[PDB]
Coordinates of C-alpha atoms in Angstrom, one line a residue:
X2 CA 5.3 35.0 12.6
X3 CA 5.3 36.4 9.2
X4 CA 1.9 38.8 7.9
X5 CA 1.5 35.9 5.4
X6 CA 2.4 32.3 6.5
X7 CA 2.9 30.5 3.2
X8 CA 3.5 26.7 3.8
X9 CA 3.9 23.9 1.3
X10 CA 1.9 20.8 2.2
X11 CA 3.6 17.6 0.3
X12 CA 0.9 14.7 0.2
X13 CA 1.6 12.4 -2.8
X14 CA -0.7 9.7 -1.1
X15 CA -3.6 10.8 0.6
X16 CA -4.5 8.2 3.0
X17 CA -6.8 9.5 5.7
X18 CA -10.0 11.6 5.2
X19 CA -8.0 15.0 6.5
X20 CA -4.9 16.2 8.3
X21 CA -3.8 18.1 10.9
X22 CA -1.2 20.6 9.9
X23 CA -0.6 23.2 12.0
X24 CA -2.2 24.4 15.6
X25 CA -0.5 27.3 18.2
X26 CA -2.5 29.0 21.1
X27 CA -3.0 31.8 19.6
X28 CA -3.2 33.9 23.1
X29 CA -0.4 33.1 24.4
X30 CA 1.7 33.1 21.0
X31 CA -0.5 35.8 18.8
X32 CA 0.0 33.0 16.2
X33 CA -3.2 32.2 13.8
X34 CA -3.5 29.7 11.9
X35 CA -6.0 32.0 9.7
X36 CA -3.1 33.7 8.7
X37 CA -1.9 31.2 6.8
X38 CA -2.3 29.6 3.4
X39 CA -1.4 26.5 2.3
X40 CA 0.5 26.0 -1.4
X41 CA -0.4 22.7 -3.2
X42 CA 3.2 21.8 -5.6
X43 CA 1.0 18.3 -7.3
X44 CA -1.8 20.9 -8.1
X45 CA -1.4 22.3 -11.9
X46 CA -0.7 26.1 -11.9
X47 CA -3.7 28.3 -11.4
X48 CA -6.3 25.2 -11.3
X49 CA -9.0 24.7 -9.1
X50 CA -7.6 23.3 -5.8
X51 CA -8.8 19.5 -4.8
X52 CA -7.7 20.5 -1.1
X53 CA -9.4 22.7 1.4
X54 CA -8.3 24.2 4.7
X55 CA -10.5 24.7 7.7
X56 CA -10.3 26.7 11.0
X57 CA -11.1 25.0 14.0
X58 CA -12.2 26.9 16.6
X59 CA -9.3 26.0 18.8
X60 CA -6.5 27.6 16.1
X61 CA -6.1 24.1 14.5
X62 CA -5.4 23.6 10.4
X63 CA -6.9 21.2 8.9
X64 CA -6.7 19.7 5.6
X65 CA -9.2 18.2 3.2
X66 CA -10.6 17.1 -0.2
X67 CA -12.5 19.7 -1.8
X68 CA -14.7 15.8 -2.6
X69 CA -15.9 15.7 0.6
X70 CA -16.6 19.4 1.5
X71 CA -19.9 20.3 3.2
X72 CA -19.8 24.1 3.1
X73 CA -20.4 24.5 -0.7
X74 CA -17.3 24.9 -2.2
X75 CA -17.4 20.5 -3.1
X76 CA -16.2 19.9 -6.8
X77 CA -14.8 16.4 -7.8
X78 CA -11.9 18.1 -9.8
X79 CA -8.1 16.5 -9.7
X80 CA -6.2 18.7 -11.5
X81 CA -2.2 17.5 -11.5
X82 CA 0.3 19.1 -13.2
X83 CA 2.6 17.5 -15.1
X84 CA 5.1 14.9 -13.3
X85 CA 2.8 15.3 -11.0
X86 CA 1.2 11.9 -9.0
X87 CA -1.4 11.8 -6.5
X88 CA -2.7 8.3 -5.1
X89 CA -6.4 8.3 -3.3
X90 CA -6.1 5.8 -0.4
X91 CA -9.3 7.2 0.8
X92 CA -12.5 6.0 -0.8
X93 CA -14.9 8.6 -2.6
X94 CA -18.4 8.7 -2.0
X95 CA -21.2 10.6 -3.4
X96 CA -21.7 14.0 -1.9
X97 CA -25.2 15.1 -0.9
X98 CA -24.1 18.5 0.3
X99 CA -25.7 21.6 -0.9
X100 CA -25.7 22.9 -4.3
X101 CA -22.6 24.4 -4.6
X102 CA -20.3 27.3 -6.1
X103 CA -18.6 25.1 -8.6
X104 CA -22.2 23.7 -9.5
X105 CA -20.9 19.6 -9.8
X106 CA -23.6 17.2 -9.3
X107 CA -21.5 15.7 -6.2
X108 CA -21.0 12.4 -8.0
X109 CA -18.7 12.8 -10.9
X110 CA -14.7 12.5 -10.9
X111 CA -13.1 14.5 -12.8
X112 CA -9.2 14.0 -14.2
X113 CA -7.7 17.0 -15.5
X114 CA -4.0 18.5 -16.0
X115 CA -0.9 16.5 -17.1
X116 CA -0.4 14.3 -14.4
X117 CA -0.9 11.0 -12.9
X118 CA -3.9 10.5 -10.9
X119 CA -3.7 6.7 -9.0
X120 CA -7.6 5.6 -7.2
X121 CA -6.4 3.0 -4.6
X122 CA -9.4 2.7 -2.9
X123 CA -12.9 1.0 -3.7
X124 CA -14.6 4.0 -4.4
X125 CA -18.7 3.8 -4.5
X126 CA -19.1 7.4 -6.2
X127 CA -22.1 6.8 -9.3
X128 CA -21.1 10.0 -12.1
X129 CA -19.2 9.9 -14.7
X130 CA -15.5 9.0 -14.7
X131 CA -14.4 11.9 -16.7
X132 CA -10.8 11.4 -17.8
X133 CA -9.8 15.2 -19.5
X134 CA -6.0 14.9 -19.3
X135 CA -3.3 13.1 -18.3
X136 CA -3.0 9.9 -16.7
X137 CA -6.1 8.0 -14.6
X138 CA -4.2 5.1 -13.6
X139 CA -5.8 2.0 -11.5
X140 CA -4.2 1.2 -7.7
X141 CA -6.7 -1.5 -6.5
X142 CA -9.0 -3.9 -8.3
X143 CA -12.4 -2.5 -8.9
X144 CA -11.7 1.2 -7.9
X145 CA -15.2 2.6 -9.4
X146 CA -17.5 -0.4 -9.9
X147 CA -20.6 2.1 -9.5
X148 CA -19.2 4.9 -11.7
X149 CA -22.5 6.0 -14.6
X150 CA -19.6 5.8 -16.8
X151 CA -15.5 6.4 -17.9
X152 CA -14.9 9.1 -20.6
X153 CA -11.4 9.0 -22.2
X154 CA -10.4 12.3 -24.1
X155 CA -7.9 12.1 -26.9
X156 CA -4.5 12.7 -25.4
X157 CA -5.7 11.2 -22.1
X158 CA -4.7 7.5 -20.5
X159 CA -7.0 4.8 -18.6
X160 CA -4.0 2.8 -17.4
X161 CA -5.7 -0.6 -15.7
X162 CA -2.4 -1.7 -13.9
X163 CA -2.9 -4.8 -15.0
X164 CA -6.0 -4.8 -12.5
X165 CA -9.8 -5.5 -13.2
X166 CA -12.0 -3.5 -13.3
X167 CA -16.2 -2.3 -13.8
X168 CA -16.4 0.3 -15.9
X169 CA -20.1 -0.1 -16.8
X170 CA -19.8 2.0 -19.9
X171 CA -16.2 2.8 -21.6
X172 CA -16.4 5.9 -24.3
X173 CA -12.5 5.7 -25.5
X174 CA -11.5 8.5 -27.5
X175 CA -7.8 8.6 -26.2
X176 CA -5.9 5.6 -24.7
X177 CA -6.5 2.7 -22.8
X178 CA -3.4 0.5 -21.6
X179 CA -3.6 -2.8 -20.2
X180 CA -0.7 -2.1 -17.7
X181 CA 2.3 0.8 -17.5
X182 CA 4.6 1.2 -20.2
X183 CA 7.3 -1.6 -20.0
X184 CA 6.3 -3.4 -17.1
X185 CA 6.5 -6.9 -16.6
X186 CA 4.0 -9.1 -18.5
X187 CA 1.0 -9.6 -17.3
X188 CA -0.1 -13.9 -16.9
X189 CA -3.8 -13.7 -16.0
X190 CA -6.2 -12.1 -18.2
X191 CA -7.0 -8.2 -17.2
X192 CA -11.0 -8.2 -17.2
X193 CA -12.9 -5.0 -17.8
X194 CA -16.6 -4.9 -16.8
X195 CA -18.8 -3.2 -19.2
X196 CA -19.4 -1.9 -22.3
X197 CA -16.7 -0.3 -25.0
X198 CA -16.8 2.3 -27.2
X199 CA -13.8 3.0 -29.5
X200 CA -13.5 6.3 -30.8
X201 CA -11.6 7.1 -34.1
X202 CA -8.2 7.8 -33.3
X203 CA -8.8 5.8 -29.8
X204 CA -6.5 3.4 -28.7
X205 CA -6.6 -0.1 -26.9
X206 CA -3.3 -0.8 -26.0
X207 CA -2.4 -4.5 -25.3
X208 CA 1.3 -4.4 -26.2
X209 CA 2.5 -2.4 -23.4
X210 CA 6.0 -3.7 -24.0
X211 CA 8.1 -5.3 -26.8
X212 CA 8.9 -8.4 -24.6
X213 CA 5.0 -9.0 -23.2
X214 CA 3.4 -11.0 -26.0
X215 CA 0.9 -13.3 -24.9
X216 CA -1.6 -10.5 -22.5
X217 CA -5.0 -11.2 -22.7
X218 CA -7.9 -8.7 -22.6
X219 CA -11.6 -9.2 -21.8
X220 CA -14.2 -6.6 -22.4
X221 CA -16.7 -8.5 -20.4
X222 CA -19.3 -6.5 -22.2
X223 CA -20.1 -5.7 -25.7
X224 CA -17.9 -4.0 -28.0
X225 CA -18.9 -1.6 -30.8
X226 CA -16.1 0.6 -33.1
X227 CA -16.0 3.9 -34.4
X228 CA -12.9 4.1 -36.2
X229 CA -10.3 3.6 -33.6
X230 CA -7.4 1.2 -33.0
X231 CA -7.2 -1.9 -31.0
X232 CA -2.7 -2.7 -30.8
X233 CA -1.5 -6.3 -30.7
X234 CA 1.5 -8.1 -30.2
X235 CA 2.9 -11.1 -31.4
X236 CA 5.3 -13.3 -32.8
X237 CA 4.4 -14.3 -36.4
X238 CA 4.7 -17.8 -37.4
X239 CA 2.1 -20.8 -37.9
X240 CA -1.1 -21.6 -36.0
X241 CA 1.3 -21.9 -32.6
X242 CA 2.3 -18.1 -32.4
X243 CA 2.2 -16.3 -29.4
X244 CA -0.2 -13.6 -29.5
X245 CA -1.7 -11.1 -27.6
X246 CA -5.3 -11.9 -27.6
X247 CA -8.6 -9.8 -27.5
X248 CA -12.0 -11.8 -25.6
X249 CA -15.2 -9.5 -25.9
X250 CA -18.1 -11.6 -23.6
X251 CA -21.0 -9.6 -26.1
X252 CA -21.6 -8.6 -29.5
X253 CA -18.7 -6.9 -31.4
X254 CA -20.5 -4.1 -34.0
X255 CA -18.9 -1.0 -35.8
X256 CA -15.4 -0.9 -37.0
X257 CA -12.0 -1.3 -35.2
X258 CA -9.0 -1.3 -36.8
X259 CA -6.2 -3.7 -35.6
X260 CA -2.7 -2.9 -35.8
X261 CA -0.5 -5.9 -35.4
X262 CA 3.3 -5.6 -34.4
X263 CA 5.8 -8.9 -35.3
X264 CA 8.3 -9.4 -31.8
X265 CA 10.6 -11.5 -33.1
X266 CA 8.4 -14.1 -35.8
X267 CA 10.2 -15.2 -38.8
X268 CA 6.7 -15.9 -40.8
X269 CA 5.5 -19.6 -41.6
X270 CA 2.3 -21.0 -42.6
X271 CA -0.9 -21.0 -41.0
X272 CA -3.1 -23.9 -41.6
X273 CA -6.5 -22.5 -39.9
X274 CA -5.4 -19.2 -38.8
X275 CA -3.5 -17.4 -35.4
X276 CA -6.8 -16.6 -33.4
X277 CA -6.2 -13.1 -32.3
X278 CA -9.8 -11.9 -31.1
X279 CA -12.8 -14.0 -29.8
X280 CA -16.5 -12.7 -29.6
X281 CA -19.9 -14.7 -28.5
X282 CA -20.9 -12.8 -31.8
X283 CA -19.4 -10.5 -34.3
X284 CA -20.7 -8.5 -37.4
X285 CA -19.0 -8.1 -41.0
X286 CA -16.0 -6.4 -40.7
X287 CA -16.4 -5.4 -37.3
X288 CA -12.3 -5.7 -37.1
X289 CA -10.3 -4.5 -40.3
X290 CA -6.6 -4.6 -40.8
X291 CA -4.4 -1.5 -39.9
X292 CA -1.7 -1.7 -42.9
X293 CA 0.2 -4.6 -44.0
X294 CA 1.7 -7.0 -41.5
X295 CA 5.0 -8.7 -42.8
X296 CA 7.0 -11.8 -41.5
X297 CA 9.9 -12.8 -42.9
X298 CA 8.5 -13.8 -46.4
X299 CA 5.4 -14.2 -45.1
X300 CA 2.4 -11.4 -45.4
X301 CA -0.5 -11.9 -43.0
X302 CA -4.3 -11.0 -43.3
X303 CA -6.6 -10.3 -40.8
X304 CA -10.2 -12.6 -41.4
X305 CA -13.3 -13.7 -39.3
X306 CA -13.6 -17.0 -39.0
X307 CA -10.5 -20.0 -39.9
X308 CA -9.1 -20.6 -43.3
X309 CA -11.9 -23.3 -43.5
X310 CA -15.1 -21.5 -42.7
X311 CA -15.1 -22.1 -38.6
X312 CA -15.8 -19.9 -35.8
X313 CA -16.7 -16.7 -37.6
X314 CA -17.4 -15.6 -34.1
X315 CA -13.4 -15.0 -34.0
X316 CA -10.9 -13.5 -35.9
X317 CA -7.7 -14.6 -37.3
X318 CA -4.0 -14.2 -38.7
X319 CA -4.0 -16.4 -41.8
X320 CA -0.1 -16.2 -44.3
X321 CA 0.3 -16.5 -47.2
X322 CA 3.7 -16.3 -49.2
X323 CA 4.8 -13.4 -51.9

């Protein structure tokens, strides 16, 4: 009964198109729901709200995604602070409402703030994937497979959850996991649909955790580098060592730089080489050495194609003792 009816609306999985929060006769009880405003704690401080209340005409609350708002105030904004994470069990579709006040094109997903932002639902929206800040993290297979295309800003995290996934077009200038930080390795290959770009001072992570080597990767696409890094595990010894493992379906072009960490290898020799990356096709020096890699009292180079000549479509580990 308060002039202004503040309430804090806790959704951290938003699993229906809206809600009903609150309803009164206002009549009888000279309690309106217009009077009240509804305080979002996931939504970073000051940021434009993903969540919109309506009036009914019958003094009922409900709650909504600013996505699919039809009385132009849409936007395709989730902006979570930090600590922060919100899961989409509802599937996002392209708006075709009305030019609007926050002038978006009614197809693009934006991820902004420090916080975690998890799509669990096939959603068919066809903009951009734009990925500011913070955490876009994957909660179903194939979550976007219509998206025009994912940007990753430095200091911002495509987590795949060890799911696949159609990106159509991947412009990586921050990181992109295979799966969360120390979680359990992964045994079937995570496939990404589409095309990568790798930004200098991008990552691909495939080493997500110390005790993981062995995950396998597949831009099922082309891949062309711009400077950035591409992180491997493995365990250094002869031809037989476990390795993470990079499998690109097109053309590798440009430069990426390949930083290799040692779990555990003591160093031997390799007679043809540990095959680390495979490509249908692959130009000179598309993949270059990050630093030195160092087993035991072995040192390790990174070359396309075996010790012998063979399969300069892939790339190699080869020792050699100092």
């Amino acid at each position: 009964f308060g002039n202004n009816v503040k309430v804090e609306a806790i959704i951290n999985n938003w699993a229906q198109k809206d809600y009903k929060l609150l309803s009164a006769d206002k009549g009888i009880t000279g309690f309106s729901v217009s009077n009240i405003s509804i305080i979002n704690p996931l939504l970073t401080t000051g940021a434009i709200d993903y969540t919109k209340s309506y009036i009914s005409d019958q003094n009922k609350l409900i709650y909504g995604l600013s996505w699919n708002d039809t009385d132009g105030d849409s936007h395709g904004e989730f902006n979570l602070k930090e600590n922060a994470e919100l899961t989409v069990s509802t599937i996002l579709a392209d708006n075709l409402s009305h030019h609007n006040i926050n002038s978006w094109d009614g197809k693009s997903l934006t991820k902004s703030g420090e916080g975690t932002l998890i799509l669990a639902e096939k959603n068919t929206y066809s903009g951009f994937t734009n990925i500011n800040a913070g955490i876009l993290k994957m909660g179903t297979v194939e979550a976007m497979t219509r998206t025009a295309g994912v940007i990753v800003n430095k200091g911002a995290t495509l987590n795949f959850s060890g799911m696949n996934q159609t990106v159509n077009t991947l412009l990586n200038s921050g990181t992109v996991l295979i799966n969360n930080i120390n979680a359990p390795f992964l045994p079937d290959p995570v496939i990404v649909t589409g095309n990568m770009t790798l930004e200098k001072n991008g990552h691909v992570i495939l080493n997500n955790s110390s005790s993981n080597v062995g995950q396998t990767y597949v831009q099922k696409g082309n891949w062309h580098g711009k400077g950035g890094i591409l992180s491997l595990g493995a365990v250094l010894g002869n031809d037989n060592s476990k390795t993470d493992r990079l499998e690109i379906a097109g053309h590798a072009s440009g430069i990426t730089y390949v930083a290799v960490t040692n779990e555990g290898g003591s160093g031997d020799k390799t007679l043809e080489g540990v095959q680390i990356i495979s490509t249908d096709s692959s130009d000179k020096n598309a993949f270059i050495q990050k630093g030195r890699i160092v087993a035991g009292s072995y040192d390790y180079r990174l070359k396309q194609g075996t010790v012998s000549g063979l399969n300069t479509n892939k790339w190699y580990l080869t020792s050699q003792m100092d």
